[PDB]
Every structure is written in structure tokens, then in C-alpha cells.
């Protein structure tokens, strides 16, 4: 199984990036970089090689919904999987994220099992 899949973990909260990085490590993914908002994320992404994004919503500089739309509109990365992991849990917002092309959606607080389950589901949808 491909464990070199390179993840970008985006969240303004250091503890949450640490949680997500540690969980990915458990799953066998050691190629993980971090960003603190959408602007930071877009800079990291131009270094190449990223195969998967896990992103927060509420962040300064550029929020996760803006980030997601930007990625979906870029020919350099239009179909790049983006898992939302966020405290944002209003039905309207979840629908909006989905319509904006989110690959999946996890509400905080979440268990290790939930993250693994949602990542697996995305892999399956894409033939990964």
C-alpha cells in the first residue's frame, strides 16, 4: 500500500495540526507537511508532490472554504482530495463545503477511528 502519499495539514491551531500529523503517522503516512491558513497552504502546495489535503475551516488570512474553492479552480490541482476537519457544524455550511467540492467532512471533536474511516472512504471513491 502506498504510504508515500504526501499530506498537507492545514489548521491555525498548533495542537490540532499535531493531532492530525500524529494520527496520519499511526496510519503509516510520514510524508506530512503543515500550514496555518489558506495563504500558507497555497505557498506550500507550489513546492509540488502533495496528494492529499486535510483542512480546517476557520483560519485567518484565508479560510478553508476559500482555500478549497481556490484548489478546485486551479488546473494545477483541481481534483486534489480535500478532507474538511472543522468545528463548523451548521447544516448550511456543511452543504456549502460539499457543493464547493469537499471530498469529505469531519466535525470536531473527532476520534482517531473517525479520521481513519473518512480517509479510507475518500481513497475508495478515487480508486486509491
Amino acid at each position: 500500500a502506498d504510504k508515500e502519499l504526501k499530506f498537507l495539514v492545514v489548521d491555525d491551531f498548533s495542537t490540532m495540526r499535531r493531532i492530525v500529523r500524529n494520527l496520519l503517522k499511526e496510519l503509516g503516512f510520514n510524508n506530512v507537511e503543515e500550514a496555518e491558513d489558506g495563504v500558507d497552504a497555497l505557498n506550500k502546495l507550489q513546492a509540488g508532490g502533495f496528494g492529499f489535503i486535510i483542512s480546517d475551516w476557520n483560519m485567518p488570512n484565508m479560510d478553508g472554504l476559500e482555500l478549497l474553492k481556490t484548489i478546485r479552480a486551479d488546473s494545477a490541482m483541481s481534483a486534489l482530495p480535500v478532507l474538511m476537519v472543522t468545528a463548523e457544524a451548521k447544516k448550511e455550511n456543511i452543504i456549502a463545503a460539499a457543493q464547493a467540492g469537499a471530498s469529505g467532512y469531519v466535525v470536531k471533536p473527532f476520534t482517531a477511528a473517525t479520521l481513519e474511516e473518512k480517509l479510507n472512504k475518500i481513497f475508495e471513491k478515487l480508486g486509491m
Binding site: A89, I94, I95, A98
Partner: peptide, 15 residues
């Protein structure tokens, strides 16, 4: 929404 509510919502959107 709980995670179960999110999953139900996204299932109804075709995920």
C-alpha cells in the same frame, strides 16, 4: 450536526 448527522447529510448529497 453530530458526525452521524454529517454522514447522513453527505450520503444524501451522493458521497
Amino acid at each position: 450536526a453530530s458526525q452521524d448527522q454529517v454522514d447522513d447529510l453527505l450520503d444524501s448529497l451522493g458521497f
